[PDB]
Structure formats: structure tokens, C-alpha cells
């Protein structure tokens, strides 16, 4: 009957409303136990990943220096990423602090609490990325056979990278360790036959060192420390075989930095570059 229909609809309305209320109350009680400044857990993001800027789809780079449209996507992506790294957007001193040009110890800017207000970020200037900054070089190197990719370390709150001590033999002598303040980064060919065609490697870092300075760490969380500019490392090749596909691997060494076979980007690259004639 119509009255029966009204009674059943009223019952279902109140029942579903009560269920929704219980669900929302449980969500609120759970959210009361998470902090808005630091994550409760870092199980999955504790070993930071390594990522390049051009953001290539199939882990491959195939372009022709002749046709502008062949490298237009990479050039536009690099411009889009590096637009925020221009010094024109870092001039304000209330929120930016000029940190020295020489690598130094990590900066502890207080503690993860609402007190002490916001944080100040060390400024990263494009001049340190020599001949891949876009200031006085067009196409960001994508002229005849001069590709360069900007390597970055994934942001993790409270993360202080620990560079490897030079006690154990790391690699061939780089003639400058500076371990306590620089996290080493090196790009090598994937296997033996790609080392003969990869060519020389040019690293452009802050202060001339080949790695990420530790003065920019730790990250504080986009709320305490917004407008944070992570350190960059432009890697340029300048010599590679035309019409050939070369697999190049970039690895970040450190005591705390980890690797994984399952995860291919945990401190490593699998990038392929092919330069057509």
C-alpha cells in the first residue's frame, strides 16, 4: 500500500543515513590519528627513486636534429620543468635564502611542528647547469647530437642521503670525492657493447661536482616548506653513434640509497637514446 511504501522508504532512508554517518565517523576518527606535517609511514618511499626530466614514454628517446618537431616535445617538456627554476621566480628573499655555491652539510630547519612557521628554501640557479640551462643555448642541447637529460632524486620528507665513505673502493678515482656533502651520481652503459657507442659523458652539477648537494636536504613537506627546489644534475653526452639505439643506466650511489630488481627506477635509469640522421 501507499502507507507501506512510505514506511519502507522511510526505513531505508534512515538506515542508509545511519550507515553513511557511521562510515563518516570512522573516517574522521581514523584521520584524527594522521599528522598533516609528516606521513605516518614511509615503507614504500623510503628508498627514493631516480627520475629524468624529459619524461619519455617507453623509456626511449628517438629524435632527428633536422626536423624541429622531432625534438619539440622534449624541448617543450624541459622548458616547462625548468621554468620554475629561473632566478626571476626566486628573487623574493622572504621565502628564499641564498645558500652558498659550495656543497655543505644538510640544513636542519627546526622540527616537523606547526610552530616556527614556514621554512626557507635554498635557491638553485640555472647557471650551474652549464650549456643545458636554456639561458644562452637554444633547444636545450637538441642540436646535432648533443642530448642532455636532467636527473633528479625523488622527494622524501625527513630524508638525509648518506653518501658512501671512500674507505671501500667505489670506482676508478674521480680525483675529487667530497663525500660528506655530495651524493655521487654516475651514468654508464647498460652492458659491454653499448659502452663503445655511448661516447663521453658530461655532468653539470652545483659547484662543478657530479652529484646532488646535501645542503638541500631534508624536504619538509609542501606545507612547512612549499616552493622547494630540489637539486638537479644535467647529464650531456655530446658524442653518440647516429642511427643506433644505446641503453644507458644512471645510478645514484649511497649507503642509505637502495636498489631493487622489482623496481627499475629505485635509484636507477633504463633510458634509450637513438639519434637518427
Amino acid at each position: 500500500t501507499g502507507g507501506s511504501w512510505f514506511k519502507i522508504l522511510l526505513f531505508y532512508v534512515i538506515f542508509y543515513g545511519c550507515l553513511a554517518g557511521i562510515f563518516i565517523g570512522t573516517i574522521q576518527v581514523m584521520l584524527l590519528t594522521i599528522s598533516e606535517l609528516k606521513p605516518t609511514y614511509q615503507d614504500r618511499v623510503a628508498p627514493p627513486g631516480l627520475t629524468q626530466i624529459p619524461q619519455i614514454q617507453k623509456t626511449e628517446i628517438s629524435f632527428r636534429p633536422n626536423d624541429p618537431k622531432s625534438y619539440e616535445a622534449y624541448v617543450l617538456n624541459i622548458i616547462r620543468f625548468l621554468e620554475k627554476y629561473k632566478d626571476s621566480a626566486q628573487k623574493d628573499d622572504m621565502i628564499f635564502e641564498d645558500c652558498g655555491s659550495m656543497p655543505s652539510e644538510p640544513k636542519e630547519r627546526g622540527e616537523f611542528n606547526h610552530e616556527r612557521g614556514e621554512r626557507k628554501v635554498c635557491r638553485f640557479k640555472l647557471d650551474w647547469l652549464g650549456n643545458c640551462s636554456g639561458l644562452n643555448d637554444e633547444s636545450y642541447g637538441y642540436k646535432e647530437g648533443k642530448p642532455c637529460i636532467i636527473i633528479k632524486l625523488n622527494r622524501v620528507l625527513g630524508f638525509k642521503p648518506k653518501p658512501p665513505k671512500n674507505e671501500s673502493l667505489e670506482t676508478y678515482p674521480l680525483t675529487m670525492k667530497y663525500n660528506p656533502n655530495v651524493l655521487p651520481v654516475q651514468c654508464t652503459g647498460k652492458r659491454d657493447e653499448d659502452k663503445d657507442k655511448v661516447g663521453n659523458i658530461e655532468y653539470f652539477g652545483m659547484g662543478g661536482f657530479y652529484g646532488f648537494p646535501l645542503q638541500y636536504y631534508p624536504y619538509y613537506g609542501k606545507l612547512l616548506q612549499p616552493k622547494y627546489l630540489q637539486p638537479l644534475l644535467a647529464v650531456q653526452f655530446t658524442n653518440l653513434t647516429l642511427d643506433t639505439e644505446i641503453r644507458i643506466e644512471c645510478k645514484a650511489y649511497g649507503e642509505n640509497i637502495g636498489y631493487s630488481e622489482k623496481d627499475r627506477f629505485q635509484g636507477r635509469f633504463d633510458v634509450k637514446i637513438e639519434v637518427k640522421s
Binding site: 507501506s4 514506511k7 519502507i8 526505513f11 531505508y12 538506515f15 542508509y16 550507515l19 557511521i22 562510515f23 570512522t26 573516517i27 581514523m30 584521520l31 594522521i34 609528516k38 606521513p39 605516518t40 609511514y41 614511509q42 615503507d43 614504500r44 618511499v45 627514493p48 627513486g49 627520475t51 619524461q55 619519455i56 614514454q57 617507453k58 633528479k152 625523488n154 622527494r155 622524501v156 620528507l157 624536504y219 613537506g221 609542501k222 606545507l223 622547494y228 631493487s260 622489482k262 623496481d263 627499475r264 627506477f265 629505485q266
Partner: protein, 986 residues
């Protein structure tokens, strides 16, 4: 199909019709061309479907069509992905699992699907191999198959009748038509028209019936399948290919669930088309919908439940041939039961004996040890001696330590009954028969209806000749001039004759066959010891006898039958007796069992009481009715329907097997589930047409046991009430199992709906929900079949098949909407807890699935600004999926607890009374622990290890489910029929 019976014709008309001759027969050419045209005299076996097609047809029944569509969609998705260079796999696994599920479900359904078989194999024991037929006036032995209609055949004693013949020459021929009437009483044969009905015409022999004694000659009229037993076999093999009530309920449940799944899939596929999704995403969503909305493990669980019940019933000597038949007994509304062999013991037994002008009652139980009916009274010694000495039956050899009622005896049925009585009440009559010498006289000639035996007493005191005689009571009385009442002998008083006659009439009224007894001592003054005796009955007198007593036989019911019938009638079942015996015996047995109560009274009895015409009495007053075969052969079906509807207690008498089939069909026209009990060939068509057929084990015949769905090995008729108990318990526990199975579909379906609509990362995968469907819920589904009865099961009325369904709308609504939604809510709470505690707040997960599942992006920014590689994102996804799985499991623990009852409370029913429930809970604990910390230590099948706190987030939601269900059942209990019983009870 020939039915133009012509037993009215004389010999000459038979000759002209069939073109033969008694002296000659049929010529060889004539017989060969008959064998060519008419066909061999052999029951033609029916066409049967080979088992492999019966097995293959199971792969398209149930939920298997949806699973096949899902497997096809999985293959299409994989080929599309392979074209686009996607080695992710994860879909061949799903297709293989779906195909394996289809195969396993088909295997289980084939195991549950009937038994097929044919009845013809049972008739081979009766069909004769050869026959003595005459051709060209020569007596030759010819195989019965070669015999064809029209030829003259001669039948001796002790052999099966070759075919349906019309007797022309007979000499003391007595047949045993137990396959047509169910009665082993020898039926005499003649060469004259006796009855209009060919089944009682007395001048027709029947195919496969045995001739007990004598010679006969007849003209074959029907052969092969045109014979009466041929039609019986054709009917018993050509009917019964119909679904069972439990099969119909399961099919309706499948229809409801499949309709829900199809509707949801179609509507959400249309919405996905209307929301700019790629075809691959749409078909993946469709596969997830199909897998989530199908209860794969339920149809096998029902089979396992039925198998467990069948085993625990076969433990009680009740073999269940058809697995689907355990349920049917319990939804049965009408039990049409055979009289002889089923309700009665099929053995002639003395019931009443009359002397001293009083009626004594004798025990008739099969396992009786002794008899005590005022034995110390007078006249009992003379009655004992006359019963012992005046008998011809003898026990069979090899019977030293055999139970007395189970000892095989050679002799007449009446002689066997008296001999069993004497052995029981005296112990050893062999010594008594030996010590009392028997003169070589025992005239038991036909048309005499009496027999006498002269003996000499072994007692030295008397030492006088004795003439004991028994026979028809009227002949005994007319030869009697005195009666022995308490030692001394009264004259033939008018009052004594009146008492004799009224005892005769009442004993006949109880449907019993009386036998009169009388003895006459011969004084030695007139008959010396050496006096010669002659068989001519002229050397000794046969008059002026003394009547001692009068005994009657009943063929009594089994000991457990009356109580079982009373319980069945108290359980709301209507018992009908359909028998081939005479109406008087059937009515007496019905009154003695409980089919007709003592107070209930039929039309004929009302007419006798009021002395008015039988047409004058209104049939509304009569509460019982006895219908003979003739009253039913000319009954229009509407009249039969009204007869069944009006009268609560009905007895059918002198019914042919076709009439039994007619009665069963007419009872099924009233939308009633019928059960048939029988132990004879004539019950096979009824035992097949019935929804469940029950046959006796020891007393039963091969045809009945082949045509039945259940066989009682010890012939304990009391097993029917236990069967009804088990069937009703099965129905209730099946409701519980179906609710518990359907409740977990919604927690598996809601994540995919939310994933499509709000674009969250996938809360759970398809293999994960398959693990719920196949691994965790099966043992609790079996456990819910061990729940004890909530209320008085055997006091309810039988369920209405059309009105009451196993899966109604209330159960489906409660399982999908009231429960299931709560489980989805708890699982989503756990999922949001897992995601938020690692960096992704609940509001940051809206419409993130496109960037979440992009292998190109490896710097996804969460709420805190951290950047996540693709593999870390999918590892977090697997963690959330495993946690959602665990939440579903725990809320299913709660739902098992709340589904243990339907109207009661867990406080009343008991938490630990059902240990299989706790076995199921422990099994889920073990299975989840393995699936989380084994498989998952290596990330596989979207399983990862879980933190300790993710195992207990959904426990409060389980407690909430339990509290809500307890409140619902409490309000159902408090106010019955108060809009809460009508809407919330399932």
C-alpha cells in the same frame, strides 16, 4: 496402441479372428510371416542418452553461461593487450581459473544429476526364455521371443506364461498376478467370461505371470510391448523425466542472480560508454562485474550438502539413489502408499479367534515372542489340539535357529498362518504331530471347502479316535449340532447360533478370512482300534460335530507403520492409500493403520447407520471415502480433483497401475509435491511419476527398487518421518547457506563500481575476489548445513511450492542491501586507512587512477609532496587490496555468526554447539594468513604482507553488523506479524 479386448468371444470367433486351430495351430510359413510383420515377443528397451552428452550439457547449466562469457572477454582483453605490447598477463590466469571453475561445477552438477537407467533389466527375471507352442499339431519347444500372436500354446505348472493368451482349455490352472495387482494370492483360471474388466476376466493369462499349478491351453492375443506388462514397462520407462522441487528452487535462484548480474553489467557498461572510457577498460569492468556477481562455489556447496545428508541417511539403512531426493521428502504434501508389502507385512497372520462366545485378540507383530490371550480359560486345549493336528503345511529344512516368523514354509497361505501360530504359541508341534498318529486320510478336494484328518490320541487315559476338521464356517456349522463352551458342550441353541452368526458377520466386517473348526471324538464302543478307515468318507461320520472355535487372518500392518502415519498426519501431510486389493481389506487396513481415524465415517457407513438410501445422504457429512477401480475408470478429471480436494482421508481399491498413475497425476494437478511408497511392479509407473519414490528393501521387487529415488533397506516405514525432518532442515539450512554466500558478492562488486565512478585506484582485484569466492567461503557454507532445528520442524505445515521459494525477494534484498553494504563500508574504511597512513589522503585519491596506473609517470606527488615511482604505487595498491580482502573476511566471520540463526538469537542457539562453524573460522584464519604472509612475501597475485593493525580495523564493523542483526531478530521475535516480520524476516 491396441485396447480392443475381446475376451467375450467364444472359441469359434477367436478362431475366425486369429486364423488358427486348437488341433492344428499355425503353419510354419504363417508363423514366420507373423514374426516378420508383428515383431518379436520381446520388451523393447528404450533409447537412452549416452553419459558423455549428459556430462557436456552440465557445462551450460547454472552460472556457467556467464562464466563462459567472462572467459571469452578475458581472452579478448588479452589479445587486445598483446597487440599493444602488454606482457602483464594477469588475464590468462583469470581465464584459466574461470574454465577450471566451469569444469568443476559441471562435474559436481553431473554427480548431482539423477541416475538415468532403465527398468527393462528388472523384468528379465520374470520373462520366460522358451515356450511349448504347437505348430502343425506338433509339440515343440520354441523361444519366447520367437512366439507371435495367434498360435496355440500349452502352459504347465510352475513356469512363466509365455505371452498374453486367451484360455480355451484349462484344467485346475491357478496363476499369480502379483505383477498386475500386487497380491500373491493365487487367482484361479477358467475358460468362461467372468468379468467385463480384462484384468479380472479369469479366462486370460498374462505375460510373465507364473502358473502355480495345473495345465492350460490358450490362444496368444498380445505379444511383446502390446501386453499388459509391456504397457507397464513402457509407462515406467517413458515418464519421470521432470525436474525435482529442489532443482526448480535452485534454477529460480540462478535466474534471480543472473538477472541481477546482467542488469548491473548492462547498465554500468552503458554508463562507462557514456563517460569516455576505452573499450579495454569497459570490458575489464564487465569481467570484474561478472566474476563478482556470480556465486561460483555455491552450486557445488549445495551438492556437497546433499551428499552429506545422503550419507548420514544411508547410515540409517536408507539408500538414496538420486541425490536430489533428500530434500523432496519434507516438502511433500501427499503420500500415496501401497497397502500390501508396504503398509502390511505381506504375510498371512491370525488376528482374531472366537470361542466361549467372546472375541480374543492376538498379537501380530513380526518380532513377537509369545502370545497371551486368556490362555488359561477353558476350551483352549481342544482348540490348540485341533489347530495343531488339522494342518498340512510343513517347515522347510535348514531352519534350526531361524526366527519363527521368518522361517520359510511350504504350503498354503492359511496353512502357513496356522502353522506359524501353533509354532509360536506351542513351541514344538512336530513332536505333537508325531506322537498323535495320523490315519492316512486328508480329503482336501475342491468344491468341498473343508478337510478332515483322523487321529488317535497318544494319551493313555483317553485312547480314542479323533476327527479334527476345519474349513468354511458355514459348512462347519451345518455339520455341527453342539458347541463346546468352557469344557462341557451346549446343544445347538438358537442363541448360540445367533452368537456364531453375529461373530461371523463382524469378523467379516473387519475384512478378515475366517475358518471354522470342529472335532468329534469317536468312542471305542462303535469304532474299535483296528477299525479300517476309507478315503470315501463312508466308513466314518462327518455329522453331529462339535464347534470349538473360529479363527480369522488379516495380513496385519507392520508394527511401526501406525505411529509413522500418525506422525506424518500430525506433520501436515495428507496420506492416501492406493492399492490393488479388495475394498473391504483396504478399508480395514486403513482403519487399523490410521489413514482413516476411528471417528471418521464413510458414505456407505452413514447409509447403513441411518438405513436411508445411499443417494439420500449428503456427502458433506462424510469425512472419508473409498473409491474402487470401477468408480475411477469412468470418472471425469474434474470429478477426481473435487474428490481429492473434498475428502481428507481417501482409499483407492482394485486399481490398475495406469489408474495409480492417474491418481498421482491428479494429485500433482493440485500443485502438491507427492511421495509414493511401493514394493511391486505395478507401482513402477507411480514410483516414476511421483516427485520422490520410496521402495522397500527386503520386501521390494527389482522394478520398484530401480524406479525409486530412495530405498528402505530394513523396510522401516518410520524412516519417512525422519526423511521429512531432514528435508525441512535442509531447506532452512539452504536458506542460511544461500544468504551467507550472496552476502559477500556486494563487497566484491562495490570496489569496481567506485573505481569506475570516482576514479580511485583499484580497491581490489579480480583474482582476489575469486579467492574469497572459492577458498574462504566454502567451509562455512558447509558448516551452515550442520545447524540444528530452530523450532518444531515436524509441527509445521508443508511449504507451498508456488508461494514459498528457497530464494524469495526478502532474502535477496537482505543479503544485498541490508548486509553486504555494511561489509563494503568496512572494507573501504580499511582501504582508506591503508592509503592515508602512507601519504595519500582520501580526497587526493579522487580521479587519480589515470595517473596512478601510468607506467610513464614515476614522480607522482602525494599529499605530503613525496614522489612515488610506478612500482611503489602498485605495491601500495596490492597492500590496499589485501587489506580489503581481510576486511571482507572478518565481516564474513560476523555474518556467519549472524546467519547461524534466522529468528532466534545467538544467546539461545549457542555459539559453540556447532563445531564445524569454528572449523570454518579457523580455516579462514589459516587461509588468509597463508595468502598474506606466504604468497605475498614474494609479491604475486596482488598479495602483499600486512601490518598488524590492518588486520583489526574492520573488527568494529563486524561488531556493528552483529549488533544490527541481533536487534533485527529481537524485533522480529517481540512483535510477530507487525510489518517487521513481513518485511525483515527471510
Amino acid at each position: 496402441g491396441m485396447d480392443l479386448d475381446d475376451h467375450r468371444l467364444s472359441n469359434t470367433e477367436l478362431e475366425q479372428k486369429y486364423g488358427t486351430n486348437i488341433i492344428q495351430g499355425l503353419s510354419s510359413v504363417r508363423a514366420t510371416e507373423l514374426l516378420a510383420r508383428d515383431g518379436p515377443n520381446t520388451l523393447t528397451p528404450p533409447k537412452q542418452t549416452p553419459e558423455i552428452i549428459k556430462f557436456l550439457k552440465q557445462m551450460v547449466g547454472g552460472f556457467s553461461i556467464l562464466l563462459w562469457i567472462g572467459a571469452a572477454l578475458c581472452w579478448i582483453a588479452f589479445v587486445i593487450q598483446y597487440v599493444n605490447n602488454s606482457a602483464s598477463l594477469d588475464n590468462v590466469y583469470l581465464g584459466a581459473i574461470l574454465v577450471l571453475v566451469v569444469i568443476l561445477t559441471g562435474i559436481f552438477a553431473y554427480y548431482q544429476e539423477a541416475k538415468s537407467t532403465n527398468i527393462m533389466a528388472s523384468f528379465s527375471k520374470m520373462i520366460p526364455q522358451q515356450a511349448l507352442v504347437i505348430r502343425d499339431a506338433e509339440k515343440k519347444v520354441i523361444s519366447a521371443e520367437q512366439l507371435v500372436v495367434g498360435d496355440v500354446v500349452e502352459i504347465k505348472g510352475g513356469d512363466q506364461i509365455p505371452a498374453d493368451i486367451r484360455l480355451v482349455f484349462s484344467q485346475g490352472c491357478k496363476v499369480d498376478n502379483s505383477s498386475l495387482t500386487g497380491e500373491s494370492e493365487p487367482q484361479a483360471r477358467s475358460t468362461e467370461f467372468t468379468h467385463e474388466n480384462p484384468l479380472e476376466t479369469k479366462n486370460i493369462g498374462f505375460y510373465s505371470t507364473t502358473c502355480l499349478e495345473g495345465t492350460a491351453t490358450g490362444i496368444v492375443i498380445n505379444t511383446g510391448d502390446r501386453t499388459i506388462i509391456g504397457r507397464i514397462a513402457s509407462l515406467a520407462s517413458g515418464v519421470g523425466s521432470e525436474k525435482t522441487p529442489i532443482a526448480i528452487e535452485i534454477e529460480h535462484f540462478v535466474h534471480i542472480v543472473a538477472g541481477v548480474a546482467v542488469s548491473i553489467d548492462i547498465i554500468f557498461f552503458i554508463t562507462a560508454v557514456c563517460m569516455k572510457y576505452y573499450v579495454l577498460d569497459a570490458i575489464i569492468f564487465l569481467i570484474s562485474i561478472i566474476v563478482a556477481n556470480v556465486p561460483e562455489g555455491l552450486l557445488a556447496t549445495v551438492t556437497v550438502t546433499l551428499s552429506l545428508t545422503a550419507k548420514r541417511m544411508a547410515k540409517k539403512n536408507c539408500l538414496v539413489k538420486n541425490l536430489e531426493a533428500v530434500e523432496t521428502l519434507g516438502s511433500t504434501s501427499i503420500i500415496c502408499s501401497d497397502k500390501t508389502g508396504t503398509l502390511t507385512q505381506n504375510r498371512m497372520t491370525v488376528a482374531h479367534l472366537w470361542f466361549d462366545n467372546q472375541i480374543f485378540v492376538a498379537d501380530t507383530s513380526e518380532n513377537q515372542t509369545k502370545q497371551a490371550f486368556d490362555q488359561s480359560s477353558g476350551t483352549w486345549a481342544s482348540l490348540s489340539k485341533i489347530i495343531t493336528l488339522c494342518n498340512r503345511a510343513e517347515f522347510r529344512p535348514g531352519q534350526e535357529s531361524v526366527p519363527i516368523m521368518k522361517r520359510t514354509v511350504v504350503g498354503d497361505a492359511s496353512e502357513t498362518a496356522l502353522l506359524k501360530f501353533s509354532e509360536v504359541i506351542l513351541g514344538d508341534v512336530m513332536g505333537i504331530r508325531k506322537r498323535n498318529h495320523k490315519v492316512a486320510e486328508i480329503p482336501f478336494n475342491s468344491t468341498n471347502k473343508f478337510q478332515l484328518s483322523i487321529h488317535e490320541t497318544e494319551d493313555p487315559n483317553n485312547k480314542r479316535f479323533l476327527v479334527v476338521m476345519k474349513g468354511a464356517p458355514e459348512r462347519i456349522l451345518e455339520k455341527c449340532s453342539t458347541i463346546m463352551i468352557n469344557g462341557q458342550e451346549q446343544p445347538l441353541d438358537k442363541s448360540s447360533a445367533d452368537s456364531f452368526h453375529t461373530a461371523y458377520m463382524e469378523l467379516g466386517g473387519l475384512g478378515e478370512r475366517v475358518l471354522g473348526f470342529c472335532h468329534l471324538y469317536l468312542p471305542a464302543e462303535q469304532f474299535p482300534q483296528s477299525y479300517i478307515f476309507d478315503v470315501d468318507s463312508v466308513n466314518f461320520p462327518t455329522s453331529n460335530f462339535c464347534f470349538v472355535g473360529l479363527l480369522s487372518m488379516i495380513d496385519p500392518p507392520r508394527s511401526t507403520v501406525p505411529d509413522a502415519v500418525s506422525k506424518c498426519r500430525s506433520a501436515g501431510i495428507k496420506v492416501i492409500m492406493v492399492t490393488g486389493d479388495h475394498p473391504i481389506t483396504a478399508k480395514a487396513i486403513a482403519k487399523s493403520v490410521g489413514i482413516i481415524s476411528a471417528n471418521n465415517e464413510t458414505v456407505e457407513d452413514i447409509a447403513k447407520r441411518r438405513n436411508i438410501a445411499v443417494e439420500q445422504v449428503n456427502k458433506r457429512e462424510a469425512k472419508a471415502a473409498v473409491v474402487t477401480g470401477m468408480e475411477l475408470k469412468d470418472m471425469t478429471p474434474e470429478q477426481l480433483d473435487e474428490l481429492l480436494t473434498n475428502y481428507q482421508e481417501i482409499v483407492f481399491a482394485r486399481t490398475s497401475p495406469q489408474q495409480k498413475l492417474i491418481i498421482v497425476e491428479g494429485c500433482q494437478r493440485q500443485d502438491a509435491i507427492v511421495a509414493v511408497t511401493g514394493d511391486g511392479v505395478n507401482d513402477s509407473p507411480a514410483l516414476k511419476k511421483a516427485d520422490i519414490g520410496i521402495a522397500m528393501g527386503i520386501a521390494g521387487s527389482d522394478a520398484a527398487k530401480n524406479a525409486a529415488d530412495m530405498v528402505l533397506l530394513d523396510d522401516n516405514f518410520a524412516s519417512i518421518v525422519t526423511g521429512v525432518e531432514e528435508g525441512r532442515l535442509i531447506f532452512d539450512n539452504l536458506k542460511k547457506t544461500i544468504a551467507y554466500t550472496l552476502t559477500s558478492n556486494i563487497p566484491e562488486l562495490c570496489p569496481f563500481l567506485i573505481y569506475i565512478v570516482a576514479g580511485l585506484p583499484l580497491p581490489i582485484g579480480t583474482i582476489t575476489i575469486l579467492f574469497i569466492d572459492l577458498g574462504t567461503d566454502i567451509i562455512p557454507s558447509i558448516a551452515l548445513a550442520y545447524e540444528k532445528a530452530e523450532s518444531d520442524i515436524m509441527n509445521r505445515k508443508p511449504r507451498h511450492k508456488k508461494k514459498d521459494r528457497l530464494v524469495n525477494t526478502q532474502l535477496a534484498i537482505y543479503s544485498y542491501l541490508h548486509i553486504g553494504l555494511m561489509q563494503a563500508l568496512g572494507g573501504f574504511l580499511v582501504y582508506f586507512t591503508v592509503y592515508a597512513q602512507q601519504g595519500f589522503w582520501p580526497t587526493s585519491l579522487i580521479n587519480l587512477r589515470v595517473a596512478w596506473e601510468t607506467d610513464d609517470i614515476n614522480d607522482l606527488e602525494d599529499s605530503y609532496g613525496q614522489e612515488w615511482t610506478r612500482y611503489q604505487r602498485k605495491y601500495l595498491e596490492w597492500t590496499g587490496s589485501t587489506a580489503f580482502f581481510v576486511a571482507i573476511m572478518i565481516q564474513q566471520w560476523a555474518d556467519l555468526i549472524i546467519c547461524k540463526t534466522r529468528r532466534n538469537s545467538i544467546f539461545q542457539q549457542g555459539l559453540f554447539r556447532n563445531k564445524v562453524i569454528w572449523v570454518g573460522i579457523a580455516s579462514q584464519v589459516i587461509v588468509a594468513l597463508i595468502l598474506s604472509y606466504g604468497l605475498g612475501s614474494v609479491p604475486a597475485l596482488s598479495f602483499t604482507m600486512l601490518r598488524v593493525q590492518y588486520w583489526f580495523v574492520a573488527v568494529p564493523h563486524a561488531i556493528l553488523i552483529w549488533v544490527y542483526d541481533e536487534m533485527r531478530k529481537l524485533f522480529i521475535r517481540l512483535y510477530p506479524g507487525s510489518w517487521w516480520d513481513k518485511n525483515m524476516y527471510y
